[PDB]
Design a protein around this ligand. Sequence first.
Ligand SMILES: O=C(NO)C1(CS(=O)(=O)c2ccc(Oc3ccc(Cl)cc3)cc2)CCOCC1
Ligand SMILES: [Ca+2]
Ligand SMILES: [Zn+2]
Ligand SMILES: [Zn+2]
Length: 164
Amino acid sequence: YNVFPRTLKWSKMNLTYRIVNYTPDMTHSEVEKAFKKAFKVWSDVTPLNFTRLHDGIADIMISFGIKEHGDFYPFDGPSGLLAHAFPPGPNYGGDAHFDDDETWTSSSKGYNLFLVAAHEFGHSLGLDHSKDPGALMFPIYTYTFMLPDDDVQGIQSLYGPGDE
Ligand SMILES: O=C(NO)C1(CS(=O)(=O)c2ccc(Oc3ccc(Cl)cc3)cc2)CCOCC1
Ligand SMILES: [Ca+2]
Ligand SMILES: [Zn+2]
Ligand SMILES: [Zn+2]
């Protein structure tokens, strides 16, 4: 027999992600690089491994949309909500949605995709918001990068340190 896990977390170390569509604001490669770096933030401190899928069903489906986009959490246009992600689980579990009414960038202008993605992926992996103002999982955007200790402690509580 098996009882459900004590916390929402993936039961495997190898996860896949798929970039369903792209934002008008950046090139495909910029977006792909931002997401790759965002995942590396977490794989670097755990035994987690991320492989990108070009199509099909991935553990973490990533998309850009506006207003009502297929869930109970519609976006709100410019500003306000920037993005949201679902904790580990079936179907939409792990999925991360970014508001395409925001101006996404690979620099300090608008909202840096790498930073917001890194925070959202924390959610996709099982982390909720932290109270520590210096944590990546703090619910308010700040532009900067080294994963704060609070986040390291949180993700390792779920998956372990991996090598080192
Ligand atoms: O946190 C969020 N999504 O994860 C919500 C806030 S949000 O959309 O403004 C948002 C999303 C991502 C953010 O990313 C960062 C958080 C901390 C830092 Cl250093 C950098 C980036 C910061 C703020 C949206 C959904 O409801 C809960 C709050
Ligand atoms: Ca918005
Ligand atoms: Zn959504
Ligand atoms: Zn958040």
